Amino acid sequence: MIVPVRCFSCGKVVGDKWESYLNLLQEDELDEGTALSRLGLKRYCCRRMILTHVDLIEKFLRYNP
Amino acid sequence: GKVFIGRLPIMLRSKNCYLSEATESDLYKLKECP
Amino acid sequence: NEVFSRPEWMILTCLPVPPPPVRPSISFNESQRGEDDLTFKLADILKANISLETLE
Amino acid sequence: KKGIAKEHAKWGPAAAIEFEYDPWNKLKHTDYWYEQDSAKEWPQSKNCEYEDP
Amino acid sequence: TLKYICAECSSKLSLSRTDAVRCKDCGHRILLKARTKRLVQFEAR
Amino acid sequence: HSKRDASTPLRSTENGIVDQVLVTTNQDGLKFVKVRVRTTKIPQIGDKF
Amino acid sequence: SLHKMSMMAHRVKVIPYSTFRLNLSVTSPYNADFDGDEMNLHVPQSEETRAELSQL
Amino acid sequence: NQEDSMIMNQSSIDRGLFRSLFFRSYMDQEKKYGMSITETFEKPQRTNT
Amino acid sequence: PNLNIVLTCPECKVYPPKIVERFSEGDVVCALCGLVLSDKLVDTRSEWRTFNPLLDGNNLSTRIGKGETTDMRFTKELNKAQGKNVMDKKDNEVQAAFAKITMLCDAAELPKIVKDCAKEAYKLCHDEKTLKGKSMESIMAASILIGCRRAEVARTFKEIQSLIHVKTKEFGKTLNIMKNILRGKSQNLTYIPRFCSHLGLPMQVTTSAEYTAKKCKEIKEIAGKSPITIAVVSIYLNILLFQIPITAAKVGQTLQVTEGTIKSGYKILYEHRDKLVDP
Amino acid sequence: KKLMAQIFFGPTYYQRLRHMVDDKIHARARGPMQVLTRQPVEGRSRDGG
Amino acid sequence: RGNLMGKRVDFSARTVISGDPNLELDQVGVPKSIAKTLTYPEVVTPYNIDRLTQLV
Amino acid sequence: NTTVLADEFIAHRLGLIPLQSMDIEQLEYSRDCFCEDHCDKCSVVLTLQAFGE
Ligand SMILES: [Mg+2]
Ligand SMILES: [Zn+2]
Ligand SMILES: [Zn+2]
Ligand SMILES: [Zn+2]
DSSP states (O other): OOOOSSOTTTOOOOTTOHHHHHHHHHHSOOOHHHHHHHHTOOSHHHHHHHHHOOOTHHHHHHSOO | OOOOOOOOOOOTTSTTSTTTTOOHHHHHHTTOOO | OTTTOOGGGSSOSSOOOOOGGGSOOEEETTTEEEOOHHHHHHHHHHHHHHHHHHTO | OOOOGGGOGGGOOOOOOOOOOOSSOTTOOSOOOOSSOHHHHSOOOGGGGSSOO | OBOOEESSSOOBOOBOTTSOSOOTTSOOOOEEOOOOOSOOOOOOO | OOOOOOOOOOOTTOOOEEEEEEEEEOTTSOEEEEEEEEEEEOOOTTOOO | OOSGGGSOOOEEEEESSSSEEEOSTTHHHHTOOSSSOEEEEEOOOSTTHHHHHHHO | OOTTOOOOOHHHHHTTTTOEEEEEEEEEEOOBSSSSSBOOOOOOOTTTO | OOOOOOOOOTTTOOSSOOEEEEGGGTEEEETTTOOEEEEOOBOSSHHHHOOOHHHHOSSOOOOOOOOSSOOHHHHHHHHHHGGGSSSSOTHHHHHHHHHHHHHHHHHTTOOHHHHHHHHHHHHHHSSOTTTSOTTTHHHHHHHHHHHHHHTTOOOOHHHHHHHSOOTTTHHHHHHHHHHHHHHHHOOGGGHHHHHHHHHTOOHHHHHHHHHHHHHHHHHSOOOOSSTHHHHHHHHHHHHHHTTOOOTHHHHHHHHTOOSHHHHHHHHHHHTTTTTTOOO | OOOSSOOOOOOOOOOOOSOOGGGTOEEESSOOBOSSSOSBOOOGGGTOO | OOSSSSOOOSSEEEEEEEEOTTSOTTEEEEEHHHHTTSOOOOOOOTTTHHHHHHHO | OOSSSOHHHHHHHHHTSOOOOTTOTTSOOTTTOOSSSOOTTTOOOOOOOOOOO
16 A cells, blocks of 8 residues: 555565656656656566555545544 | 424435535545545 | 053143253343243243133 | 575565576577477577577 | 543543543544553564 | 453454554443454465465 | 265374365365365374274 | 465565455443443453452 | 352362363363363353343243244134233233333333333332322333433433323322332433533533533532523523523423523523633 | 476466465364253354364 | 264364375375364373373 | 554565665674673664654
8 A cells, every 4th residue: 555665576675666756757757668667677577566556545644633 | 393203224425415415525534435 | 552652642641841951041141041942832831731720 | 683585585685686598598408389480489588699699 | 540532523531430431622422542652562574 | 249251352363453442332322342453464375366 | 075085084294384285186086176175184082993094 | 386276475475465454343332231230341350250 | 959069179179279261172170280170161152142031030921923834714813812811910011011111212212221221110119009000100200210310311300291291290209109119129410411402502512511500509509499490591601601592482492491490590690600711 | 497398477466365274274172062962062263163 | 964963073173275295195284283282192001101201 | 653554564664674784794693692682782773753744
């Protein structure tokens, strides 16, 4: 529900990439297959993690505590 | 003049439910998953 | 068979009351010591017998 | 604390380790599945160039 | 007495036994229970 | 001379942290309580995927 | 368990985590697979029922 | 991995693959009987109970 | 006879013993030597897992009706054989009491606990020289008020009088004996909130009155002759502390109270307005 | 060493089903017995047979 | 049918099965957690008394 | 911890955070120190305060 740290299969650290990736996607208008390659996620094991993550934590944060 | 006769269980999000018209930001306020 | 079954035994006159273990009570929460059906039907038999004894 | 991956994947200092030998298949350590032509359907490795065909 | 927290008003409560199960500031009837103070240990495994 | 206990133990095979405990009254003003316990299940050998 | 090969006697080997493990060939008599099938174990409590298992 | 088993990867399990949370919640409630006998939420001792 | 069993480790014997029940093994063991005293323990929750003697006692019952496989020349006689023993039992007046009071408290929109205390409060007295009839209402009118207050919900006499017309007098004498029936067998705060809701007010106006009425009660001002009235004046005291239109005339009929007791009751308030300042 | 066959290989959505093994392992030697019939009770939850 | 012809029993276990290409045809792998529970009453003789003493 | 994540969830993420361990031989396996389970000869202690402002 948030940004896994390291890629499951691979171990590569990936959880310092979600914001950089979202921003790449959003301000520079890249497509993912290019956003990802720019963050260095080359193995499709690592691409899976970011490309496919679902950032549910934003929806949790809405519930006022 | 008008008489109580009993209580009708309400289906959620139906015209008569508090949520029927609530807005997302309001659904969170009530703690209901949108 | 005149030792083990006379035909006149198919008509109940006495009734054998099974001991508790056949119909144990569920002693639950110090007041819900619920009772087995066979206790009930037996009560309900015993009443309906107790009554008819008077009515003669 | 100090530990090794063999005990939990967190104590692991390496990510994916590539590894490859004999990129032309000279040793015949693998046999290639194919439909018409093996040489077409299996892309050359990068390393396939550091050894002569 | 022990701490509690209103479900909605969200105010620490500290009622006792044989007090009403009821929130100040909103007679809301749901209280949480003001998580423990002793530390708790997990493994990052 | 006083009292027989009627407490509710955790299941014989479960564990994990109490997550939250809330205290209210039913419709009839009787106190009652709901405890939620949280566990983490890590995939294991006999698990079904 | 609809034929006598659905109950055979095995020898224990004690292993770690919580599944029964059995050889693969034995699987077709039991008619089992490993998608969550469960199987039951019965331990013989005597010196002579033991030999009934091992020998029959 | 025969007969519908599978081999899973232990390292990927360590890094989070398929972990999950489990939440079991228990309810309990104290009953009144005749305003004579009335269950109570308390912590008992082996001396009074 | 004494028909009694006690367990004690015959090889420690030291005590009224220190034994533990290992349920999951169906054992009891001397907590000292671990000799198992007795086994094959029988379950204790599964029993009622598959599933009123305080009222229905020992003369039991069973609802007898018609099954699928019976014609009406046998069904209706089950309705014509069940009727021969309804007078040896006063229990009609026992159950039809409960059924009546159940019909009452339930129609009265009451918590199902009060129903029991009244199902009790009937059953406990249920025949006395003090009772000796007395219309069989006043008890079901007081045993409810008993069953209500004894269940920590207090309602006014008029409120029950709305449910049952008891001539307001057959009530009073019946109550006194009844209360003393249990004393031998052995709280107006409840009115503040039920009133506010009857006027549909937010919690603070009701919140305050608990302070005010208690504080108006705590020092002086016996004030009222059935303090029902001097409850409401706290609302009137506090409603005027707020500015919400509950004009006196609307108060009265909504709560069925004299208006006179209000203003004169409010006399002791337009003068006592000193010490109720929380904020 | 190179495997002599080549492996079909790539991602695939897998779901983790509800049937964890720890909720299923069950053993019993001499537990409690039913009341009416005095055979072992039923159900893993209550230490059945 | 349900209480005489068949019944529930002590000394049994049930769990999920798995395969093992490294057990003999007749072994079964038993989880240590289960083996700790099921039990077998052995008789003390001269031939095992010390070994049984160890277990105790 | 009043965040929207469970403790063992957060604790699990902390484990995977890769710490500088260039000079790791100068530490000891926490089962070789004789400390009451941990000391500076066998472990490093960090802390984390965060508050949503
Ligand atoms: Mg199967
Ligand atoms: Zn990777
Ligand atoms: Zn002893
Ligand atoms: Zn140390």
